[PDB]
Design an enzyme around this catalytic site. Structure first.
Site, PDB file in Angstrom:
ATOM      1  N   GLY A   1       0.795  -1.402   0.117  1.00  0.00           N
ATOM      2  CA  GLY A   1       0.016  -0.024   0.098  1.00  0.00           C
ATOM      3  C   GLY A   1       0.996   1.406   0.011  1.00  0.00           C
ATOM      4  O   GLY A   1       1.011   2.005  -0.782  1.00  0.00           O
ATOM      5  N   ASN A   4      17.835  -9.876  -1.407  1.00  0.00           N
ATOM      6  CA  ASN A   4      18.421  -8.285  -1.220  1.00  0.00           C
ATOM      7  C   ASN A   4      19.847  -8.227  -1.571  1.00  0.00           C
ATOM      8  O   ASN A   4      20.235  -7.340  -2.244  1.00  0.00           O
ATOM      9  CB  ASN A   4      18.147  -7.731   0.110  1.00  0.00           C
ATOM     10  CG  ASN A   4      16.657  -7.742   0.622  1.00  0.00           C
ATOM     11  OD1 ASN A   4      15.701  -7.646  -0.186  1.00  0.00           O
ATOM     12  ND2 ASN A   4      16.545  -8.142   1.865  1.00  0.00           N
ATOM     13  N   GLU A  56      22.389   5.797 -21.649  1.00  0.00           N
ATOM     14  CA  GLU A  56      22.756   4.806 -22.852  1.00  0.00           C
ATOM     15  C   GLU A  56      21.831   3.816 -22.618  1.00  0.00           C
ATOM     16  O   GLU A  56      21.866   2.700 -23.070  1.00  0.00           O
ATOM     17  CB  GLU A  56      23.948   4.573 -22.710  1.00  0.00           C
ATOM     18  CG  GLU A  56      25.180   5.604 -22.992  1.00  0.00           C
ATOM     19  CD  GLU A  56      25.230   5.883 -24.348  1.00  0.00           C
ATOM     20  OE1 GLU A  56      24.312   5.756 -25.438  1.00  0.00           O
ATOM     21  OE2 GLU A  56      26.238   6.355 -24.959  1.00  0.00           O
TER      22      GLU A  56
HETATM   23  N1  LIG Z   1      12.523  -8.926  -2.356  1.00  0.00           N
HETATM   24  C1  LIG Z   1      11.612  -8.484  -0.966  1.00  0.00           C
HETATM   25  N2  LIG Z   1      10.596  -8.265  -1.025  1.00  0.00           N
HETATM   26  C2  LIG Z   1       9.765  -7.994   0.086  1.00  0.00           C
HETATM   27  C3  LIG Z   1      10.662  -7.815   1.344  1.00  0.00           C
HETATM   28  N3  LIG Z   1       9.745  -7.477   2.474  1.00  0.00           N
HETATM   29  C4  LIG Z   1       8.573  -7.458   1.966  1.00  0.00           C
HETATM   30  N4  LIG Z   1       8.576  -7.464   0.524  1.00  0.00           N
HETATM   31  C5  LIG Z   1       7.390  -7.570  -0.297  1.00  0.00           C
HETATM   32  O1  LIG Z   1       6.552  -6.597   0.086  1.00  0.00           O
HETATM   33  C6  LIG Z   1       5.154  -6.933  -0.073  1.00  0.00           C
HETATM   34  C7  LIG Z   1       4.320  -6.030   0.948  1.00  0.00           C
HETATM   35  O2  LIG Z   1       4.894  -4.717   1.549  1.00  0.00           O
HETATM   36  P1  LIG Z   1       5.900  -4.740   2.457  1.00  0.00           P
HETATM   37  O3  LIG Z   1       7.182  -4.848   2.175  1.00  0.00           O
HETATM   38  O4  LIG Z   1       5.523  -5.568   3.552  1.00  0.00           O
HETATM   39  O5  LIG Z   1       5.601  -3.040   2.980  1.00  0.00           O
HETATM   40  P2  LIG Z   1       4.903  -1.938   2.096  1.00  0.00           P
HETATM   41  O6  LIG Z   1       5.411  -2.202   0.566  1.00  0.00           O
HETATM   42  O7  LIG Z   1       5.963  -0.748   2.381  1.00  0.00           O
HETATM   43  O8  LIG Z   1       3.640  -1.695   2.308  1.00  0.00           O
HETATM   44  P3  LIG Z   1       3.188  -1.692   4.004  1.00  0.00           P
HETATM   45  O9  LIG Z   1       3.226  -3.072   4.488  1.00  0.00           O
HETATM   46  O10 LIG Z   1       1.625  -1.124   4.065  1.00  0.00           O
HETATM   47  O11 LIG Z   1       4.115  -0.706   4.729  1.00  0.00           O
HETATM   48  C8  LIG Z   1       5.224  -8.318   0.238  1.00  0.00           C
HETATM   49  O12 LIG Z   1       4.301  -8.838  -0.817  1.00  0.00           O
HETATM   50  C9  LIG Z   1       6.579  -8.873  -0.287  1.00  0.00           C
HETATM   51  O13 LIG Z   1       6.421  -9.475  -1.541  1.00  0.00           O
HETATM   52  C10 LIG Z   1      12.089  -8.048   1.084  1.00  0.00           C
HETATM   53  O14 LIG Z   1      12.602  -8.223   2.228  1.00  0.00           O
HETATM   54  N5  LIG Z   1      12.465  -8.423   0.093  1.00  0.00           N
END
Ligand SMILES: Nc1nc2c(ncn2[C@@H]2O[C@H](COP(=O)(O)OP(=O)(O)OP(=O)(O)O)[C@@H](O)[C@H]2O)c(=O)[nH]1
Ligand SMILES: Nc1nc2c(ncn2[C@@H]2O[C@H](COP(=O)(O)OP(=O)(O)O)[C@@H](O)[C@H]2O)c(=O)[nH]1
Ligand SMILES: [Mg+2]
Lengths: 439, 49, 191, 430, 102, 52, 61
Positions: free
Chosen positions: A144, A228, A254
């Protein structure tokens, strides 16, 4: 005198920024506290860090980054960690209440009181630079606050700065693995928002990276940190040409001039090679031919997509280490000779190549080993339509009965906002289909 | 600081371990072989001129 | 401790706002600012001696204040521990700071007693009262001005003294270095 | 930041809240003298979510104990950890409702509630940034089920944007201790459905069944039942207080779990739960935790999940574990049990990870699943209600307090409407 | 802390021990113009020696003029009932000389 | 990598750097006078200490 | 003297199965979390490159 500013919004953006910044500090020799050691230098040359850092005048260095969130947990963890002295205290911007996986909340209600501070900090950072190449933005697309704040930030930046290039490295939801239930909605909305505002976008879903970790690194229980670290290695291999001398250098500008046939189509999927552990990395020569074969191998794409299901538009490959241009030419000739890989007819030559002399760096306690050669791949292909189709199907399944719609309508969003994004995605599908046909 | 390997009980030695002892070496090598360039990474001297 | 005792200053709140995560450690510069803001006078040597061991051994940036709060708040009450019924806190009266300046280190105090007796005898025979001139000379009504105007009053009423015993008396009754208070002097020449 | 206050109603609510506060204080390392004696630095970072700091350095919960009879609060004060509560937050009457919802909602509660509203307003305005309220009460007792629901109505009317979760214990037919339970249960559900943001149902029958079969202990007691309820309650909001790989608080849970505004009744369970003799021999892994989570007999409700289809389900993990393993386990469960999951919403399971395990356990999981099987509870309650109401039994004790039968009929009609529209989405297809 | 008249307060209470089932009950009597909500302190229940354990108190662990731990509060038993005195001498357990509560 | 200026065709090595000794890089003569702390420790380890 | 001691006050105020969990399950420090295992380590400018290959079958976990 070349600079680039990285924007991390959301929990995913912050957690990938931690990895990329620790990698950058280790690569440039800056200690976690921010001070280069008085003795024990690791690299020659000057102003190499100037791309990502800025000299304070005497002593330490400051990253050219700003962290955003509407929840204080991750920001407090960063401010308590060992990197507390590195970042300026007034660029770890944190809110009070979270958007709680609501694009409407993050775009209309609680992001409008923080976007002003964010933009002021962006202006303050940009005034320092003189040859600003562009902006990098990181955000998980199915969240979100991430989606909403990224939408708002790029919408403001496109009009405050204009022609400056912006790069977005998103993390799309997996075809069947997910942690939330309403993520197709805000994924569609944010794709709508960033389609007309992003210059280059990269697909970095998690399931493919999970498979890569399981196969190559031989890890059965990985956490988000390994993913990450891989993404950070991709970023480093991408940006090494700006700060290290090479036989064939490639700038940020580029990319849009070589990978984007039409202004609408700028979505790309990345591949990296080699990924190998120290237990077996030194038993083989890791030749350029074999590493580029591994890079072109379909199962090593960082996004869960099948390149065999569509044609290739263009390809961008950057080698770092001690690679030779005649080796590169031979490898590209072999790739073209291969029959299972096909390009579109209106792109006879479809490769842009780059060579760099600085080998990749290794983080202690990590998973990867040390290799003399490495290649990073950015490719544009017609196969990227399947992810849009499957997210469209998932969106339709829930929007048929108007499920979860009230949670977005109650936060100022109109009822028809979902629909317009829907035909925008359908139009993108039709554009891919129209481009991909033969002549 | 090599690993222990102090438990090397002959009463539980397999036949093929007892036959194929380390030949042409003083003892059993334990350190994983690594090339020179990985060993001398990030080692730079500096002088003023 | 004495300043907090007499002025009734509560330093607890003014540290909390700078440690929002309950860590109990605040940067040294903010410590200096808050301790100076609380109206208590500060000296460069005093500030350095407050740094002492209250700083963390890891770099000159962090300072833990919980121990400082525990050490300065012991005077008000022994509120730290309640689970020992035998232990009893001490009702508080001002502890005068011990220092060589305020004490007659050499033993000549016996002649000070003789001078006090002589002054008492002469003031009893002549029945002279002179607190009014002392309280008239000053305008802050806290402490009388230095001795150069104190001798004027002691000579106005016919009772002068030579350099030696005056020097001893003014050294005994001087406070803060140059000021010469009078209320304790009157309480000493008491009937 | 984003703190929440606590309000307790009725004897059952007070008994639940006492154990809940004991569990929370043990978790955060607060002795019953209010003096911190913890060992981990993370025990004090987010203590402002539930606690207020007073001069002298002691911690006091922001809890309000409200009732219509002084006996049970005089009893809970004398227990361990009973000195934490501020004596000003105690509010009580002297008459009592006598298991009469009309008396507790119209005559005595309406007169008393001004003071408790004042103290609630004070506590809510004291905080820096309110997150929500949480309420513990029983729907079988008169004073609780009436005064608490009127308080919920007033609190919702005063704070339209904050979140309201209530942990409700509904009367079961097998285990009944009151003859007039269906009346006040239906009257309470009528008001709860319109106002409460979130509701979690608990049955003493299900608690006894769990204690008898899973724990295999000979003598279940109200202490053990309250311990179950308190662990389940703390598991929901642990992630708000401790850092995690995936942060997810109550607002996120509500948004991800509530498809339509009138479907906000959830059924919960906890894992692991092992007997004393079998603790040394079991191994804690994600597959074991998720299988015991999705076990039907482990649910804290008399609703049987395999007689209906899950709308959405949520799992909150605690400890250090791998997100890949967690996601694959939930995907495997969803694939193997495709018949029990509604189909017109894809991938209808939510997951979260918190890195701080519960005190004394290597791993733990809290389950919150919005299932369509809860309609049987409402059906049996309505059956008993109409059986007693066709003859107007015990009706004068409610009609003598200014209430008429039209309100009873309206409550029954709304209750059946809820049941019908809630069953509609079970059979609705794409 | 903030009371001008006093720095420390002494709360006095009586401890009842039951021989029928080895349970302990404690309450503090009321004081007129005490301004304190005073009443029952601990319910009739078995109190372990340490918190969250299963080692309860017995009648041989009670004595006059000794410190006792009750939920991390350290009471000091000053005196005992007259009837209790014959009980210890009847059981043969020696008692100490009682002091006064300050 | 820089060829030796004497014309022998051998690359320079670690033993060609000495404080107070001149070198030759493409028609220029460099005189080195100081080095960092780490380099001093490294040379002492081998057994060839640098000058003051 | 096995079950003749029972009484109402003692019986109802004693927990049977929800006391402290048996040890060997308590072996987690609540102080340590994520982002602290790896990003709170210390980091080193020069690492130790020694890796050992033992002749023991790796334990399966
Ligand atoms: N690649 C990667 N994706 C992540 C990680 N943590 C969360 N996600 C992805 O982020 C999605 C949800 O969003 P969040 O990272 O939990 O947090 P946000 O996007 O800031 O949204 P909020 O939860 O409302 O704060 C999940 O479906 C995960 O796929 C991470 O450490 N690495
Ligand atoms: N879990 C639990 N339930 C209880 C306890 N005491 C009573 N109950 C339940 O509460 C119901 C009676 O509600 P009551 O306490 O009279 O509600 P009140 O009128 O608001 O005080 C009974 O049916 C019991 O099942 C307890 O200690 N624990
Ligand atoms: Mg979040």
């Amino acid at each position: 005198m070349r600079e680039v500013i990285s924007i991390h919004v959301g929990q995913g953006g912050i957690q990938v920024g931690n990895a990329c910044w620790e990698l950058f500090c280790l690569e440039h020799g800056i200690q976690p506290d921010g001070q280069m050691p008085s003795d024990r230098t690791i690299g020659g040359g000057d102003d190499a860090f100037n791309t990502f850092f800025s000299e304070t005048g005497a002593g330490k260095h400051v990253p050219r980054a700003v962290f955003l969130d509407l929840e204080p947990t991750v920001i407090d963890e960063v401010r308590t960690g060992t990197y507390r002295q590195l970042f300026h205290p007034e660029q770890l911007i944190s809110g009070k209440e979270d958007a709680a996986n609501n694009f409407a909340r993050g775009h209309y209600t609680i992001g409008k009181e923080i976007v002003d501070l964010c933009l002021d900090r962006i202006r303050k950072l940009a005034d320092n630079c003189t040859g600003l190449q562009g902006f990098l933005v990181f955000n998980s697309v199915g969240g979100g606050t991430g989606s909403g704040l990224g939408s708002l930030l790029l919408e403001r930046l496109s009009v405050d700065y204009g022609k400056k290039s912006k790069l977005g490295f998103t993390i799309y939801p997996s075809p069947q693995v997910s942690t939330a239930v309403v993520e197709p909605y805000n994924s569609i909305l944010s794709t709508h928002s960033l389609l007309e505002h992003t210059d280059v976008a990269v697909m970095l879903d998690n399931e493919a990276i999970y498979d890569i970790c399981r196969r190559n690194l031989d890890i059965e229980r990985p956490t988000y940190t390994n993913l990450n670290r891989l993404i950070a290695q991709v970023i480093s291999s991408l940006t090494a040409s700006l700060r290290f001398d090479g036989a064939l250098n490639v700038d940020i500008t580029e990319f849009q001039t070589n990978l984007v046939p039409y202004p609408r189509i700028h979505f790309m999927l990345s591949s990296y090679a080699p990924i190998i552990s120290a237990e077996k990395a030194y038993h083989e020569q890791l030749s350029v031919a074999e590493i580029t074969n591994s890079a072109f191998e379909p199962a090593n794409m960082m996004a869960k997509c099948d390149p065999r299901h569509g044609k290739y538009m263009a390809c961008s490959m950057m080698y770092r280490g001690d690679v030779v241009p005649k080796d590169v030419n031979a490898s590209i000739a072999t790739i073209k000779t291969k029959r299972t890989i096909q390009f579109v007819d209106w792109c006879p030559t479809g490769f842009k190549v780059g060579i760099n002399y600085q080998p990749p760096t290794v983080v202690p306690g990590g998973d990867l080993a040390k290799v003399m050669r490495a290649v990073c791949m950015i490719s544009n292909s017609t196969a990227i339509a399947e992810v849009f189709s499957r997210l469209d199907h998932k969106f339709d399944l829930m929007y048929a009965k108007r499920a979860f719609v009230h949670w977005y309508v109650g936060e100022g969003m109109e009822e028809g906002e979902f629909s317009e994004a829907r035909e925008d995605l359908a139009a993108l599908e039709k554009d891919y289909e129209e481009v991909g046909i033969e002549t | 600081p090599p690993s222990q390997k102090g438990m090397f009980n002959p009463n539980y030695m397999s036949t093929t371990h007892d036959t194929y002892r380390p030949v042409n070496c003083p003892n059993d090598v334990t350190e994983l072989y690594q090339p020179t360039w990985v060993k001398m990474d990030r080692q730079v001297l500096r002088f003023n001129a | 401790k004495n300043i907090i005792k007499i002025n009734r200053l509560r330093v607890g709140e003014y540290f909390a706002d700078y440690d929002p995560l309950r860590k109990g450690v605040i940067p040294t510069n903010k410590f200096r600012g808050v301790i100076s803001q609380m109206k208590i006078d500060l000296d460069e040597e005093q500030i350095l001696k407050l740094e002492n061991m209250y700083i963390l051994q890891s770099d000159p940036t962090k300072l833990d204040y919980a121990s400082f709060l525990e050490d300065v708040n012991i005077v008000f009450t022994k509120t730290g521990l309640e689970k020992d019924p035998i232990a009893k806190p001490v009702p508080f009266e001002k502890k005068n700071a011990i220092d060589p300046r305020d004490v007659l280190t050499p033993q000549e105090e016996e002649d000070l007693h003789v001078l006090l007796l002589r002054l008492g005898e002469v003031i009893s025979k002549h029945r002279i009262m002179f607190k009014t001139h002392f309280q008239d000379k000053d305008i802050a009504k806290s402490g009388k001005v230095s001795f150069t105007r104190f001798r004027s009053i002691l000579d106005l009423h016919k009772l002068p003294l030579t350099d030696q015993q005056f020097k001893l008396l003014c050294k005994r009754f001087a406070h803060q270095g140059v000021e010469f208070n009078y209320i304790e002097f009157d309480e000493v020449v008491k009937k | 930041m984003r703190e929440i206050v606590h309000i307790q109603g009725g004897q059952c609510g007070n008994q639940i809240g006492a154990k809940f506060w004991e569990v929370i204080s043990d978790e955060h390392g607060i002795d019953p003298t209010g003096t911190y004696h913890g060992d981990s630095d993370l025990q004090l970072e987010r203590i402002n979510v539930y606690y207020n700091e007073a001069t002298g350095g002691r911690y006091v919960p922001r809890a309000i104990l409200m009732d219509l009879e002084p006996g049970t609060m005089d009893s809970v004060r004398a227990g361990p950890f009973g000195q934490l509560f501020r004596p000003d937050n105690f509010v009580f009457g002297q008459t009592g409702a006598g298991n009469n919802w009309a008396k507790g909602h119209y005559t005595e509660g309406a007169e008393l509630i001004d003071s408790v509203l004042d103290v609630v307003r004070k506590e809510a305005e004291g905080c820096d940034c309110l997150q929500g309220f949480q309420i513990t009460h029983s729907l079988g007792g008169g004073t609780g089920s009436g005064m608490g629901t009127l308080l919920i109505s007033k609190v919702r009317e005063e704070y339209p944007d904050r979140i309201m979760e209530t942990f409700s214990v509904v009367p079961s037919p097998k285990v009944s201790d009151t003859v007039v339970e269906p009346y006040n249960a239906t009257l309470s559900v009528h008001q709860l459905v319109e106002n409460a943001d979130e509701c979690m149902v608990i049955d003493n029958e299900a608690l006894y069944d769990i204690c008898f079969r899973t724990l295999k202990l000979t003598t279940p007691t109200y202490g053990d039942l309250n311990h179950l309820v308190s662990a389940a309650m703390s598991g929901v909001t642990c992630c708000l207080r401790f850092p995690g790989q995936l942060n997810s608080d109550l607002r996120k849970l509500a948004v991800n779990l509530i498809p339509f505004p009138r479907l906000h009744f959830f059924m919960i369970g906890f894992a692991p739960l092992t007997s004393r003799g079998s603790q040394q021999y079991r191994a804690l892994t994600v597959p074991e935790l998720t299988q015991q989570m999705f076990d039907a007999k482990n649910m804290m409700c008399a609703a049987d999940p395999r007689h209906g289809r899950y709308l959405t389900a949520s799992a909150l993990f605690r400890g250090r574990m791998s997100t890949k393993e967690v996601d694959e386990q939930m995907l495997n469960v969803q694939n193997k049990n495709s018949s029990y999951f509604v189909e017109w919403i894809p991938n209808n399971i939510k997951s979260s990870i918190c890195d701080i395990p519960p005190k004394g356990l290597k791993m733990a999981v809290t389950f919150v699943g919005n299932s369509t099987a809860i309609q049987e509870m409402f059906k049996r309650v309505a059956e008993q209600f109409t059986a007693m109401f066709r003859r107007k039994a015990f009706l004068h004790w409610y009609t003598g307090e200014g209430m008429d039968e039209m309100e009873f009929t309206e409550a029954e009609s709304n209750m059946n409407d809820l049941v019908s529209e809630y069953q509609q989405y079970q059979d609705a297809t794409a | 802390v903030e009371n001008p008249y006093e720095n420390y307060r002494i709360r006095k209470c009586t401890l009842y021990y039951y021989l029928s089932d080895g349970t302990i009950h404690v309450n503090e009597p009321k004081i007129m113009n005490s301004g304190i909500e005073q009443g029952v302190f601990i319910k009739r229940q078995q109190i372990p020696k340490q918190l969250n354990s299963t080692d309860y108190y017995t009648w041989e662990d009670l004595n006059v003029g000794i410190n006792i731990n009750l939920f991390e509060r350290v009471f000091r038993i000053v005196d005992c009932d007259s009837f209790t005195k014959e009980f210890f001498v009847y059981m043969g357990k020696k008692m100490n000389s009682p002091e006064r509560v300050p | 990598k820089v060829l030796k200026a004497d014309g022998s065709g051998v690359y320079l090595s670690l033993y060609d750097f000495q404080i107070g000794q001149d070198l030759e890089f493409f028609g220029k003569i460099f005189h080195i006078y100081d080095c960092d702390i780490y380099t001093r420790e490294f040379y002492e380890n081998l057994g060839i200490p640098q000058g003051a | 003297s096995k079950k003749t001691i029972l009484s109402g006050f003692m019986k109802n105020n004693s927990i049977v199965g929800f006391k402290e969990c048996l040890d060997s399950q308590l072996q987690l420090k609540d102080s340590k979390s994520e982002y602290n295992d790896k990003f709170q380590s210390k980091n080193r400018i020069h690492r130790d490159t020694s890796i050992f290959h033992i002749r023991n079958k790796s334990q399966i976990i």
